[PDB]
Design an enzyme around this catalytic site. Structure first.
Site, mmCIF file in Angstrom:
data_model
loop_
_atom_site.group_PDB
_atom_site.id
_atom_site.type_symbol
_atom_site.label_atom_id
_atom_site.label_comp_id
_atom_site.label_asym_id
_atom_site.label_seq_id
_atom_site.Cartn_x
_atom_site.Cartn_y
_atom_site.Cartn_z
ATOM 1 N N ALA A 1 -23.588 64.142 -21.133
ATOM 2 C CA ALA A 1 -24.361 65.198 -20.852
ATOM 3 C C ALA A 1 -23.826 66.486 -20.878
ATOM 4 N N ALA A 2 -22.594 66.703 -20.187
ATOM 5 C CA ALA A 2 -21.905 67.960 -20.115
ATOM 6 C C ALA A 2 -21.197 68.361 -21.458
ATOM 7 N N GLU B 1 -14.809 61.089 -27.666
ATOM 8 C CA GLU B 1 -15.515 60.221 -26.714
ATOM 9 C C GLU B 1 -14.752 58.765 -26.865
ATOM 10 N N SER C 1 -24.368 60.869 -25.901
ATOM 11 C CA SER C 1 -25.521 61.333 -25.155
ATOM 12 C C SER C 1 -26.655 60.109 -24.978
ATOM 13 N N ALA D 1 -28.461 58.115 -21.358
ATOM 14 C CA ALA D 1 -29.384 58.351 -20.039
ATOM 15 C C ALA D 1 -28.725 57.339 -19.016
ATOM 16 N N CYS E 1 -29.123 57.376 -16.079
ATOM 17 C CA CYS E 1 -30.407 57.270 -15.133
ATOM 18 C C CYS E 1 -31.410 55.991 -15.541
ATOM 19 N N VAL F 1 -8.478 60.386 -24.733
ATOM 20 C CA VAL F 1 -7.400 61.482 -24.528
ATOM 21 C C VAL F 1 -6.584 60.888 -23.488
ATOM 22 N N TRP G 1 -52.869 73.706 4.748
ATOM 23 C CA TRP G 1 -51.600 74.019 4.847
ATOM 24 C C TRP G 1 -50.814 72.819 4.390
ATOM 25 N N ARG H 1 -43.991 76.613 10.669
ATOM 26 C CA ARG H 1 -44.531 77.067 12.049
ATOM 27 C C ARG H 1 -44.138 76.453 13.188
HETATM 28 C C1 FAD Z 1 -27.192 54.034 -12.526
HETATM 29 C C2 FAD Z 1 -26.888 55.360 -12.471
HETATM 30 C C3 FAD Z 1 -28.331 56.256 -12.463
HETATM 31 C C4 FAD Z 1 -28.037 57.594 -12.416
HETATM 32 N N1 FAD Z 1 -29.425 58.267 -12.313
HETATM 33 C C5 FAD Z 1 -29.512 59.548 -12.193
HETATM 34 C C6 FAD Z 1 -30.664 60.144 -11.761
HETATM 35 O O1 FAD Z 1 -31.809 59.709 -11.652
HETATM 36 N N2 FAD Z 1 -30.595 61.586 -11.870
HETATM 37 C C7 FAD Z 1 -29.611 62.250 -12.094
HETATM 38 O O2 FAD Z 1 -29.648 63.344 -11.972
HETATM 39 N N3 FAD Z 1 -28.548 61.527 -12.279
HETATM 40 C C8 FAD Z 1 -28.404 60.431 -12.210
HETATM 41 N N4 FAD Z 1 -27.104 59.746 -12.812
HETATM 42 C C9 FAD Z 1 -25.772 60.650 -13.050
HETATM 43 C C10 FAD Z 1 -25.838 61.148 -14.260
HETATM 44 O O3 FAD Z 1 -26.122 60.399 -15.337
HETATM 45 C C11 FAD Z 1 -24.392 61.683 -14.475
HETATM 46 O O4 FAD Z 1 -24.149 62.758 -13.415
HETATM 47 C C12 FAD Z 1 -24.165 62.600 -15.925
HETATM 48 O O5 FAD Z 1 -24.166 61.413 -16.816
HETATM 49 C C13 FAD Z 1 -23.020 63.379 -15.763
HETATM 50 O O6 FAD Z 1 -22.763 63.912 -17.001
HETATM 51 P P1 FAD Z 1 -21.321 64.245 -17.717
HETATM 52 O O7 FAD Z 1 -21.140 64.504 -18.899
HETATM 53 O O8 FAD Z 1 -20.455 64.907 -16.817
HETATM 54 O O9 FAD Z 1 -20.383 62.746 -17.199
HETATM 55 P P2 FAD Z 1 -20.883 61.297 -18.152
HETATM 56 O O10 FAD Z 1 -22.211 61.166 -18.645
HETATM 57 O O11 FAD Z 1 -20.224 60.390 -17.182
HETATM 58 O O12 FAD Z 1 -19.911 61.453 -19.478
HETATM 59 C C14 FAD Z 1 -18.571 61.598 -19.369
HETATM 60 C C15 FAD Z 1 -18.123 61.016 -20.820
HETATM 61 O O13 FAD Z 1 -16.760 61.140 -20.910
HETATM 62 C C16 FAD Z 1 -15.987 60.007 -21.611
HETATM 63 N N5 FAD Z 1 -14.596 60.062 -21.163
HETATM 64 C C17 FAD Z 1 -13.928 59.886 -19.998
HETATM 65 N N6 FAD Z 1 -12.587 59.974 -20.146
HETATM 66 C C18 FAD Z 1 -12.310 60.081 -21.262
HETATM 67 C C19 FAD Z 1 -11.137 60.386 -21.916
HETATM 68 N N7 FAD Z 1 -9.748 60.218 -21.431
HETATM 69 N N8 FAD Z 1 -11.188 60.581 -23.609
HETATM 70 C C20 FAD Z 1 -12.359 60.577 -23.872
HETATM 71 N N9 FAD Z 1 -13.381 60.470 -23.411
HETATM 72 C C21 FAD Z 1 -13.489 60.157 -22.142
HETATM 73 C C22 FAD Z 1 -16.731 58.764 -20.873
HETATM 74 O O14 FAD Z 1 -16.634 57.871 -22.103
HETATM 75 C C23 FAD Z 1 -18.177 59.489 -20.715
HETATM 76 O O15 FAD Z 1 -19.106 58.953 -21.878
HETATM 77 C C24 FAD Z 1 -27.218 58.314 -12.404
HETATM 78 C C25 FAD Z 1 -25.908 57.710 -12.873
HETATM 79 C C26 FAD Z 1 -25.854 55.982 -12.872
HETATM 80 C C27 FAD Z 1 -24.766 55.510 -13.029
HETATM 81 C C1 COA Z 2 -58.841 73.695 12.428
HETATM 82 C C2 COA Z 2 -58.197 75.115 12.593
HETATM 83 C C3 COA Z 2 -59.001 75.983 13.731
HETATM 84 C C4 COA Z 2 -56.647 74.958 12.889
HETATM 85 O O1 COA Z 2 -56.043 76.118 13.440
HETATM 86 P P1 COA Z 2 -54.360 76.353 13.540
HETATM 87 O O2 COA Z 2 -54.093 77.343 14.692
HETATM 88 O O3 COA Z 2 -53.975 76.639 12.215
HETATM 89 O O4 COA Z 2 -53.919 74.724 13.801
HETATM 90 P P2 COA Z 2 -53.747 74.464 15.442
HETATM 91 O O5 COA Z 2 -54.544 75.273 16.480
HETATM 92 O O6 COA Z 2 -53.705 72.780 15.273
HETATM 93 O O7 COA Z 2 -52.315 74.925 16.082
HETATM 94 C C5 COA Z 2 -51.103 75.121 14.985
HETATM 95 C C6 COA Z 2 -50.084 75.863 15.893
HETATM 96 O O8 COA Z 2 -49.638 74.732 16.678
HETATM 97 C C7 COA Z 2 -48.434 74.237 16.584
HETATM 98 N N1 COA Z 2 -48.354 72.850 16.521
HETATM 99 C C8 COA Z 2 -49.203 72.218 15.970
HETATM 100 N N2 COA Z 2 -48.579 70.716 16.020
HETATM 101 C C9 COA Z 2 -47.658 70.853 17.021
HETATM 102 C C10 COA Z 2 -46.964 69.773 17.564
HETATM 103 N N3 COA Z 2 -47.222 68.381 17.448
HETATM 104 N N4 COA Z 2 -45.575 70.158 18.492
HETATM 105 C C11 COA Z 2 -45.644 71.412 18.707
HETATM 106 N N5 COA Z 2 -46.418 72.494 18.044
HETATM 107 C C12 COA Z 2 -47.349 72.103 17.472
HETATM 108 C C13 COA Z 2 -47.917 74.990 15.432
HETATM 109 O O9 COA Z 2 -46.391 75.197 15.310
HETATM 110 C C14 COA Z 2 -48.892 76.091 14.962
HETATM 111 O O10 COA Z 2 -48.484 77.354 15.540
HETATM 112 P P3 COA Z 2 -48.478 78.746 15.120
HETATM 113 O O11 COA Z 2 -50.139 78.755 14.957
HETATM 114 O O12 COA Z 2 -48.094 79.705 16.275
HETATM 115 O O13 COA Z 2 -48.160 78.765 13.727
HETATM 116 C C15 COA Z 2 -58.740 76.154 11.349
HETATM 117 O O14 COA Z 2 -57.565 75.755 10.251
HETATM 118 C C16 COA Z 2 -60.082 75.962 10.759
HETATM 119 O O15 COA Z 2 -60.975 76.441 11.710
HETATM 120 N N6 COA Z 2 -60.313 75.421 9.750
HETATM 121 C C17 COA Z 2 -61.477 75.265 9.076
HETATM 122 C C18 COA Z 2 -61.175 74.127 8.027
HETATM 123 C C19 COA Z 2 -60.437 74.694 7.126
HETATM 124 O O16 COA Z 2 -59.281 74.850 6.894
HETATM 125 N N7 COA Z 2 -61.378 74.706 5.842
HETATM 126 C C20 COA Z 2 -60.871 75.371 4.539
HETATM 127 C C21 COA Z 2 -60.761 74.165 3.450
HETATM 128 S S1 COA Z 2 -60.446 74.752 2.056
#
Ligand code: FAD
Ligand code: COA
Ligand code: FAD
Ligand code: COA
Ligand code: NAD
Ligand code: NAD
Lengths: 444, 444
Positions: free
Chosen positions: A10-11, A32, A38, A40, A42, A80, A433, A441
């Protein structure tokens, strides 16, 4: 003229495309270690579940295209082993013949990603014990599923790979257990949001063992049991998914600065501290928009962004990387799990004064049919009210909300400014909201 | 202390709640012409389809709740016929008894919304010819469907109500025809995006007649045919869906400034030009973030926002309304239709130099199962590259993209800044670059 890229994913290839498009005189060599460009990563868990037909579907751009269409000298099976940054020479071993090749550079990019960690447990080398990173890794899991009688599956590590693969193995009809060292799975989630994860796994009959430490994998030729500090459990297939390590080992001796986990430090321009050497992707550090220090959140979106930028900056088309937000999203059975910015431990660790708001509401108009629960939590600064992070969990509309939250964090919006955005509403999509706005709030 | 609000729905009651919560001494009188407070006009098409059990489900808050819990003097069947802004007196006529009641105010809010337009065609008053605005309106449409053998349905006007109801009548199993005055339905959409709308309608056997003008409705006691400049067609039920007019009629003779449409002009603080008189919602003008002008885009999200703000500003808790973006979203059969900011007509009308990018993409990773087409268009300034507007059309992930575009427009982002946002990615939700980012890359 001479550009060398290490790593063909990736990087690395995002960089290659930039150079190729914006310099006709460029000689691009990409090196490499494996045989596949290149692709995934993930899609791997979804190939294993059978949802996608084959790993071939995960190739984004094959090597022949890179060679024939774009004139890149894309080398496969070149690992490397050394860089001499003074003489500007990259040394690569051929993975089969083991013969040594050298490549001279004007500009170098390191894009070697991360590898999965395998702790030094007994039986770690047993057949049926698997890490998941690459297409061959997936194929070896498919081989174990095909050629063996697999009914019990144990996953070590309750993070991103462990969660998605727990789904996959449940879908393949296995009895899944997960063993997690920490107090809960989805450790990037706050304690209160993590509860929703535990409920979903429980619902689908996934045993979650928390605060439990693996000591050994037991078995003859194959795994048959996992031993921990709290017990020994039958296992026909063990997936180890306990995190990753930058592939930066081979740089020891170059003066290229790395952080404590071995990630290569890069400045705004993907430049290392060593002249004409750049890094991008999972092997590099990731400036964090909210933390304001260089973090390490290895993810594919960031890798492509950094890779593209490194390419441009290598061409002297100066463009700064704006940073990561720590965004992440996971499908887990019936739930979607999304987070971005700071969770509570990150905010605490940084000594940033924060408050939270948590709303239990719906993804859409409460009166509409199949409106589903949506759990949304936001962190914001106590003083300025700057939005700091969000966690969204629910069955539907979770990706929408985390993307909006990410947009707010990128623009450094105050939490109450969310109240003012003309977000879309019709009954099948939202409430008049949006949940984010209702949370805003509630904030002080 | 004396607050009077005209209109008992979204804008009016959002204001009422703010005053009630933030001033315990306040005397709130709310004046509503109908019998139903705080209800969801948005759910009407889905009540008529049978997807929602009844119109009862559309009430958000009871008048009994307003009176007993919040101590608001909520009046029903009180139609305001005039306001004396010098004496600070509101004049309301009871819709049944015709008795006239006076209400003095210290501060007044006008929140009378808009009403559907019925042009002066012959046959206007035939049974089975309907407008859709209110819950009783919905009930009359259901009354026709219950008591009359309805086979052929004709809809006049191919905008927001025409579109949603075309779906509702199809779902009720009717033969549906739509007749539109200008060149295409979904007129807010650029010609090129509008094509997708008439493809979806056609697919479902909805007859679209364009550049065609209703001449008359023909029939006995009930409607049985629609007559145009191009022909005469059987219709058993006619929905007239041709736009709306501000309910501001009764203010003629006051000095309260209105725009050409009759919408009441308001400053940042929901104040009219007349001392202590405020307006909010569909009856008022809507500062446009991108146009930088006072527009009129009557919608419920804006109504609630403006209402809340009017209430706050009436209490002297000064807060400016940031504006509309003209966001709109519609469910149309299998399509979700979404827009925000400027379309091409709006940019041209304003003489803002712009360019466009259009991407035919998917909602999620192209290799993932049931990934669906996504059509996305962006407008941006040719000089600064400031993002100006978006149109998104497809079956899934459309509300997400438009909300992200809306966030970008609210923050006045350059189109290329989108490339730098850490938006979420996993395969079931997106591609590693979001369609918006891919479009941004194509931009100059
Ligand atoms: C199971 C899994 C799930 C993941 N899911 C997510 C996700 O959902 N979302 C997300 O954002 N990230 C996810 N990640 C992390 C993401 O894949 C990595 O952060 C990303 O690949 C990092 O890229 P990179 O190029 O730094 O390193 P890498 O992709 O790890 O590439 C480093 C490459 O350098 C090579 N290398 C290492 N040492 C040497 C060397 N001495 N000489 C030559 N080559 C070398 C390696 O062979 C490797 O291919 C996941 C990782 C895993 C393992
Ligand atoms: C229902 C209606 C009166 C809501 O009034 P509201 O003041 O926004 O909501 P609430 O009266 O429940 O109170 C919210 C406040 O209580 C506080 N609060 C709510 N739940 C809390 C909780 N569990 N603990 C502590 N504080 C709480 C919030 O911090 C908020 O404070 P702030 O008003 O000073 O920011 C108003 O939205 C309305 O008339 N709506 C009509 C329906 C509608 O929205 N139609 C358009 C759809 S497109
Ligand atoms: C079928 C339909 C679907 C819709 N769908 C959506 C949607 O999906 N999303 C969205 O955002 N918006 C939608 N809307 C629009 C949204 O419902 C309105 O924009 C919103 O109700 C406006 O609120 P308001 O308070 O300004 O006006 P209204 O809700 O119209 O309230 C104004 C009130 O003032 C009263 N009134 C009028 N004149 C007088 C008078 N002289 N004296 C006393 N009282 C008076 C009226 O009785 C009325 O109840 C839809 C509208 C319709 C008709
Ligand atoms: C496949 C890969 C090489 C893509 O490279 P890329 O440069 O991002 O994409 P392309 O090579 O298609 O080129 C896109 C460029 O062409 C332009 N473009 C694309 N289609 C176009 C079209 N139809 N007309 C005109 N221009 C077009 C775009 O604007 C973009 O321009 P930019 O690079 O100047 O911004 C790279 O993403 C990769 O190797 N990925 C590995 C797989 C992966 O992403 N894994 C991680 C998943 S977690
Ligand atoms: N959709 C996504 O975002 C996604 C999905 C899958 C993978 N990935 C990528 O893969 C990378 C690594 O995934 P991962 O799951 O291997 O790492 P991870 O950080 O997501 O999970 C590691 C988990 O293992 C636990 N752990 C560590 N040591 C352990 C031990 N000895 N015993 C039991 N548990 C232990 C940790 O506490 C943590 O919960 C991620 O950083 C991400 O880049 C991303
Ligand atoms: N999901 C949503 O956003 C949504 C849905 C329904 C209603 N609404 C609200 O209702 C308001 C009005 O809805 P609407 O559909 O009545 O207005 P509209 O502006 O949405 O549609 C009016 C249509 O009627 C056409 N038209 C005008 N005169 C005509 C004639 N003589 N013959 C044939 N066609 C003619 C116009 O060209 C236009 O296409 C909207 O402004 C919005 O506030 C919003």
């Amino acid at each position: 003229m001479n550009y060398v890229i290490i790593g063909g994913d990736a990087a690395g290839m995002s960089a290659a495309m930039q150079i190729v498009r914006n310099d006709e005189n460029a000689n691009v060599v990409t090196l490499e270690k494996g045989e596949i460009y290149s692709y995934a990563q993930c899609g791997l868990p979804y190939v294993i579940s059978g949802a996608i037909a084959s790993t071939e579907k995960l190739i984004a751009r094959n090597v022949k295209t890179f060679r024939d269409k774009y004139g890149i000298d894309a080398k496969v099976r070149h690992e490397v082993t050394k860089v001499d940054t003074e003489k500007k020479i990259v040394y690569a071993e051929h993975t089969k013949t083991k013969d040594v090749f050298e490549f001279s550079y004007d500009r170098l990019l390191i894009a070697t990603g991360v590898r999965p960690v395998m702790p030094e447990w007994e039986g770690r080398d047993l057949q049926g014990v698997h890490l998941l990173k690459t297409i061959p890794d997936a194929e070896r899991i498919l081989k174990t599923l095909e050629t063996n009688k697999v009914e019990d599956v144990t996953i070590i590590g309750g993070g991103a790979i462990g969660l998605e693969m727990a789904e996959t193995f449940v879908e393949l009809g296995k009895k899944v257990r997960m063993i997690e060292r920490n107090d809960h799975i989805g450790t990037i989630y706050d304690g209160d949001m993590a509860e929703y994860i535990y409920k979903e796994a429980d619902k689908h009959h996934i045993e979650i063992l928390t605060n439990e430490n693996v000591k050994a994998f037991k078995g003859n030729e194959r795994v048959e049991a996992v031993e921990t500090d709290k017990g020994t459990y039958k296992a026909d297939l063990v997936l180890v998914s306990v995190g990753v390590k930058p592939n930066t080992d081979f740089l020891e001796g170059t003066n290229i600065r790395t952080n404590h986990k071995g990630a290569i430090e890069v400045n705004a321009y993907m430049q290392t501290n060593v002249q004409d050497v750049y890094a991008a992707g999972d092997c590099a550090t990731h400036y964090h928009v909210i933390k304001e220090i260089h973090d390490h959140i290895p993810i594919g979106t960031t890798a492509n962004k950094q890779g593209r930028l490194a390419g441009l900056n290598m061409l002297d088309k100066r463009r700064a990387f704006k940073g990561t937000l720590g965004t992440g999203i996971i499908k887990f059975m019936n739930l979607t799990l999304a987070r971005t910015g700071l969770n509570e431990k990150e905010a605490k660790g940084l000594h940033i004064p924060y408050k939270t708001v948590k709303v239990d509401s719906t993804n859409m108009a409460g009166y509409y049919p199949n409106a589903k629960p949506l759990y949304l939590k936001l962190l914001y600064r106590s003083d300025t009210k700057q939005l700091l992070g969000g966690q969204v969990i629910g069955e539907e509309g979770v990706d929408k909300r985390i993307d909006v939250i990410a947009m707010a964090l990128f623009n450094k919006m105050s939490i109450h400014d969310l109240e003012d955005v003309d977000l879309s509403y019709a009954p099948p999509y939202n409430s008049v909201w949006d949940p984010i706005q209702q949370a805003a709030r509630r904030a002080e």
